[PDB]
Amino acid sequence: TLPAYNSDIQQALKWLHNQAPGITGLIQRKAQWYDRFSRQFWANWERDVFHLKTANPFGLMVWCIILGTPSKGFGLYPKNSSWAFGRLRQNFIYSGTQVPPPADASPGGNFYGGGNAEILNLDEIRKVLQLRYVALISNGSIAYINRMLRYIFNDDEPWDEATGLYFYLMDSTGENGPVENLAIYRKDWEGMVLLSSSPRTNHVLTSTPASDADWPGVDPAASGIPVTVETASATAPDGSATVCKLTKPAGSTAYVSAPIDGPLGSGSTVTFSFFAKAGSTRFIAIQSAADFPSRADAVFDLDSGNVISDQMLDSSVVSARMIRLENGWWRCVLTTKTVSSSFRAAYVAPAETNFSWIDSNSSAAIDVLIWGAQIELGDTPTGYLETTGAPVTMTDYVLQNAQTGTVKFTQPLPTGVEAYWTGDWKGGTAAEPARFAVGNGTQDTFTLSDPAYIGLPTSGAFKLEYRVGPALNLSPQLINLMNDRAVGIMPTCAGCDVKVIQE
Amino acid sequence: MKKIPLTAVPNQAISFNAGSSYWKIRLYQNMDMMNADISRDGVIVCHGVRCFGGIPLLQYSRQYRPDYGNFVFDRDADWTLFGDGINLFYLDGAEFAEYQALATRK
Amino acid sequence: ANYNYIVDTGVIVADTADVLSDVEAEFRAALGANINLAASTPQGSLVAAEAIARSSVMRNEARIANTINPNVSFGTFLDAICALMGIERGSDLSTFGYGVQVTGRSQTRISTGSRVQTPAGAIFTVLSDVTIPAGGVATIDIKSQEYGNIPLPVGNLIIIDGTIGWSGAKVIASTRVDPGSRQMSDAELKNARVNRLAIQGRNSTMAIKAYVSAVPNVTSVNVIENNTGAVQVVNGVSFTLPYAVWVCVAGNPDKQAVADALWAAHNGGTPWDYGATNNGVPVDGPNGVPVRDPASGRKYVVKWTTPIMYDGYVNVTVQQGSSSVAPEAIQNAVVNYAQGKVEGEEGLVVGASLSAFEVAGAIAREIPGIYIKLCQVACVAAGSPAPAPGDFTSEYVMSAFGQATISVGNVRVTFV
Amino acid sequence: ANYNYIVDTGVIVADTADVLSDVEAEFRAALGANINLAASTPQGSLVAAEAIARSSVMRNEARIANTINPNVSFGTFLDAICALMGIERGSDLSTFGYGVQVTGRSQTRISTGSRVQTPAGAIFTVLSDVTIPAGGVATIDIKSQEYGNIPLPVGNLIIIDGTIGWSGAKVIASTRVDPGSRQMSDAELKNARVNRLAIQGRNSTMAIKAYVSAVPNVTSVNVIENNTGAVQVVNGVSFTLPYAVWVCVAGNPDKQAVADALWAAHNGGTPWDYGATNNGVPVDGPNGVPVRDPASGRKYVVKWTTPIMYDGYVNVTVQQGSSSVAPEAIQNAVVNYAQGKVEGEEGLVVGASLSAFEVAGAIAREIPGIYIKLCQVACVAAGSPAPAPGDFTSEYVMSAFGQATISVGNVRVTFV
Amino acid sequence: REIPGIYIKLCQVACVAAGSPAPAPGDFTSEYVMSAFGQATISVGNVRVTFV
Secondary structure (H helix, E strand, C coil): CCCCCCCCCCCCCCCCCCCCCCHHHHHHHHHHHHHHHHHHHHHHHHHHHCCCCCCCHHHHHHHHHHHCCCHHHCCCCCCCCCCCCCCCCCCCCCCCCCCCCCCCCCCCCCCCCCCCCCCCCHHHHHHHHHHHHHHHHCCCCHHHHHHHHHHHHHCCCCCCCCCCCCCCCCCCCCCCCCCEEEEEEEEECCEEEECCCCCEEECECECCCCCHHHCCEECCCCCCCCCEEEECCCCCCCCCCCCEEEEECCCCCCEEECCECCCCCCCEEEEEEEEEECCCCCEEEEEECCCCCCCEEEEEECCCCCCCEEEECCCCEEEEEEEEECCCEEEEEEEEEECCCCCCCEEEEECCCCCCCCCCCCCCCEEEEEEEEEEEECCCCCCCCCCECCCEEECCEECCCCCCCCEEECCCCCCCCEEEEEEECCCCEEEEEECCCECCCCCCEECCCCCCCCCCCCCCCCCCECCCCCCCCCCHHHHHHHHCHHHCCCCCCCCCCCECCCC | CEEECCCCCCCEEEEEECCCCEEEEEEEEECCEEEEEEEECCCEEEEEEECCECCCCCCCHHHHCCCCCEEEECCCCCHHHECCCECEEEECHHHHHHHHHHHCCC | CCEEECCCCCCCEEECCCHHHHHHHHHCCCCCCCCCCCCCCHHHHHHHHHHHHHHHHHHHHHHHHHCCCCCCCCCCCHHHHHHHCCCCCCCCCCEEEEEEEECCCCCEECCCCEEECCCCCCEEECCCEECCCCCEEEEEEEECCCCCCCCCCCEEEECCCCCCCCEEECCCCCCCCCCCCCCCCCCCHHHHHHHCCCCCCCCCHHHHHHHHHHCCCCCCEEEECCCCCCCCECCCCECCCCCCCEEEECCCCCHHHHHHHHHHCCCCCCCCCCCCCCCCEECCCCCCCCCCCCCCCCCCCCCCEECCEEEEEEEEEECCCCCCCCCCCHHHHHHHHHHCCCCCCCCCCCCCCCEHHHHHHHHHHHCCCCCCCECCCCEEECCCCCCHHHHCCCECCCCCCCEEEEEEEEEEEEEC | CCCCCCCCCCCCCCCHHHHHHHHHHHHHHHCCCCCCCCCCCHHHHHHHHHHHCCCHHHHHHHHCCCCCCCCCCCHHHHHHHHCCCCCCCCCECCCCCEEEEEECCCCCEECCCCCEECCCCCEEEECCCEECCCCCEEEEEEEECCCCCCCCCCCEEEECCCCCCCCEEECCCCCCCCCCCECCCHHHHHHHHHHHHHHCCCCHHHHHHHHHHHCCCCCCEEEEECCCCCCCCCECECCCCCCCEEEEECCCCCHHHHHHHHHHCCCCCCCECCCCCCCCECCCCCCCEEEECCCCCCEEEECCEECEEEEEEEEECCECCCCCCCHHHHHHHHHHHHHCCCCCCCCCCCCCCEEHHHHHHHHHHHCCCCECCCEEEEEEECCCCCCCCCCCECEECCCCCEEEECCHHHEEECCC | CCCCCCCCCCCCECCCCCCCCCCCCCCCECCCCCCCCCCCCCCHHHCCCCCC
8 A cells, every 4th residue: 555565585684694695695596586587577578468569479469369360460470581582581491411500501491471461570460459459449430440540550640641641431421522721822032921812901001111201210218319210222032122221329219110000900919020131230129019008029039030038018929930031031920919909000129139128228329121011910921012101901812713723813923933722622631832833924813733632532332441551651461461351450330341452 | 335344454354244245355455555355155255356446346247246235445445544534335236236337437 | 497488379478397406506606516405405405495486486477477368267367358348257136026916905925925836936025015905916026046947827835924825826927037147157258258359349240249149148149241232142141131230149038138239239321131031030020129229219120030940969989998987978068068168169059060070079078088989960950850860960061040959868879 | 385375266365474484384394393493593584585475476466466457457557458449648747938038137147946936836947057148138948846737827937046146037928838747547547448438339329419419509419310221201301311320400509519529429431411301401501511530631521400490389378376477477487498498308309399288287387376278389480470370289290300499479378 | 179169170081001192082081990900190291171
């Protein structure tokens, strides 16, 4: 229960026998023997019993009596006893009359391992035995059998469809064939950027300020002059020298606020994004407004690419993220949810220290390069849209033809821009972006591309079939033995002939 | 439900007439659990029954059928907490059938 | 000194013994190297006792290790293996209901009233009754022990009662229940383990077989799924419908209980095909037992069949060699094997076939050293006379539908 | 001397006094009849050694004798047994907060094990030494001392063991609070095993009923199975497919949740049929609802039908008794009974007929004393004109895919 | 005896002189009676087992 168990064997051996090499030796070696034949015995016997770890074939055959499996198809006993062809296998054993030490060509060899029905790897023997137990327990569920097969063969890890792991069982259900949940992205200088079928709005008036008068600079301390916005002749990611530069003077705690129509909305997730270039500073400070003092702050390291700080003065903050762009450009996306509708502006601040807030002190004048601001509703950043004093609303695409998948765009795809899709179509799922169009500049309608995997209906009554192999590269012996309906390994329901076969 | 009187000693034996039968339970500390030897009407029923909370002591239908009853520990057996904290309860035939009915859908 | 692990052939861990040499080498190099380990000396006796204890420890550890797997286990150790898959050994009792009792009014019958049937029935009154002024009432009663001989309906004798109690009779209107006893199953439990190894499963041929076997008084069952549905015939027994499961249930259970079990293991959309005229015996002809769906809706239909009864015979020629006399211990062995009390060889079941070689093997495992010469068997239908010596052959096909039965007198042994 | 401590009824373990007496007798017979077996002598030392032996083995054997029975297994044996059905005992992890925002001064150094504390207990030890930079602000990594899902909400953390210079700690929302785990006990392992047994001890119909009734807002269920291999209206619905099952779900539950439960309880192969026209309301179009199998990202479509809604109308012509009652009480009682809030009576579940006798019984049940003169029930389609007088009948029988809802305004009470 | 559970359809035995051709199919009988001055030995290769 609780107060120890003793049972040491070494316990008999009093203080008198501390310099004996005798009684002490006898007890030492008797204790060692009892250890080896009880503790080690039961430890490796428990390892024998454990089906998850049964390298030892004795355990496998114990379990196969337990489950009633015919052992003829198994490949136990030590391997490397067949000659066949190759220096990695055995050779012809001849009559070594003089008994040479090399034992002629080989010490033996046999036709053990007759294929087309027999599996050799001991790892798969545990697999088939656990499969038999699952057949033993199974009442016919398909979700349960899929989850158990995942748990036993992939150890319950999700997998990509480019590999094609285990599939369903006897249930005459076509998975899809209509087309749903189309997440379309585009590849451009902004990277993988998804598109919206419903109108989406960027609420900033001007997103690329070229003059100081474009946005105000607000400073409660007013110790120094506000941060001035100046058109900097630096190549923007769009392919122009239209970026702006924002400089924080010494002793100044000012912040530039972009004018924006307010209120943004009550109880709505918002997302702020922008493109930044590393300048004199190394990081940027973002702030999403709310009712005083419920604002949310964050800082983004332009170089190391880490959200090293994000604070929620109230329930505001949800998440933060960062995205790379070539020529050393960065996009920082902050998602915030607040129940209030006091979104008056989004605050941006060139930070001196890595945790500098919107109003932290500036020892010197530090300038940063900014281009491409966008504050929007929803919870995911979208394609940049040039706004000149306008909260611009736009619809990325309209799906004109659902079944064939052809999609219409508002404007033709620029020469070189690419497309990607994710979802389910043609009775097949594609959880990863798939390309289907490259921009040409004169066309705006584009057909979708084939996702993947099997038509999926498998039309039939009271019978279906497995699908496996191009992922686990399983031995053909496994499939051949699996197809044997007489072994009684697979979970099955009376009246359903399900073949295994398949890759 | 009849609680069987117990004393806080490591290894003990108790005999009593319960459910129109002469039961005898010998409870002893074995390593780090409690084992029980159960005998009904002289002839022994089981040896070395490892004792657990809620789990009936007589587990094979050859022993507790028909209407003989069973013994249940509310918590995991521990002779240090015998008398108070831990109890052994005897269930008659119908009451043990009801307990099993509640026990088979847990 | 070692544990031999039979990898695939026995699943028995074998002790090696020969521990005396290891014990002697342990005493040596610890007490020195020149110890006179010869017996008739104190150290020799010490080493002998220590080796004996060590061999005993090996044997006991080997037995416990081997108890994990069946075929080498026994009660309360193989019972654990059975309980791993939910197989239960079984229990029983049998009461009798609605016994007519006529006596004077306003008389209270005391509990534990004795009531002996003509062949020493020894039935007990379990609950007290009071006689209404009509003079005839109904009481309930139970058999005293595990076994109760079938009570022929007569006027039950009154042994222990009150003053007024006049008499009590039995009518067919009274209820019944059939006991089943005697580990139940003792060593044929090893046989039943492979059958009911999927009791915990449902909606499969094996699960159907396991559950319908778990029904009491079901000696054997056969289940055919006929999954390549094209009418045709699959594994014997023709099938009218393409997809349908046919269940042949031996024994004499209750139709209601076995129907409930068959519905519990339903598989879903498989009908029950039991026609083809001679194929089996319909339990209730067309439109079998209705039963009620536990998920409440309609009274469905479950169709199973009873195997065709067959009467078997055995002719044995033995030599009574090795100076071991056994006049009529042969038919006991044959009937034990037929009833399935032997280990690993199920007796006369629905799918069985009466085989001379099997009968010979059972006879030999029961008693060896007789040099069995001839073991002709043959078999007939449920009725019919003896099939004459011309019919006695070595085997009977004994198609899947149909169950053979060997009576005690149907075995005739001849000494040569 | 060792007897048979193995026997058949489990391992019989004796007291160490008896074991020691047996070893002492063995030693006394081996060495000498009058040898001093005192614990300080070499022979007594050997006796004590062999008394610790021959009892350690007894205890080990009794510990692992019936280890294959899952109802009484323990520890790693239980883990091995439950890994057969996939119940895997979890690991005991700890909360692993990262980026904890700490404010200090100058270049203060933070050492391992400073043991910060949450506002409500939950001591977390810092696992990474860190020096605060010239900004006076840094981030650290902490791990909870205890185990399980220890909450680490956003807020300032109180310091238990702090050095000189450390001002405070707080958990910004940018911290990656990593949840831990609290393992899972043997009682919970047996809980999950019996739960899995209950799940996999049902046929298609009971599985469907249980899983769909488990969904919230599900008033009632009606599962009906073809099991004939021929399209026919065997019971209410003409199964448009030969081998299929048909399901009706009441209430206003979540479509995705009901579909997921049906898919989880799906026997497979036997497909779902929406039924023929006017055999329920085949919602979600002519194609079945697609769901994602939680096991594999592969979808499946499942089909189920809601009942055809019926507007019930009830006329009652009660006579007022001595106690004053209001017609609104009568209407409230009737609607409560129909909804089934009354104990005993199911109510107007799907596939339940509208009986004026049943509703009169409910009215009498809630309000005794009043007299009932004439009670009538009638049924119309939803959104249809109220039935004219004369159309009100004494009893309305309803199909197996319908359900009638009676509101307070659909009961006409006349006080005679 | 040694392998219970297996079902045997037909068993036949035959006896031939040592170092002689194996008897052809059909020469086997259901039982061979043997004289008083002989022994019969069966090796591994003198058993023909067919799985039906």
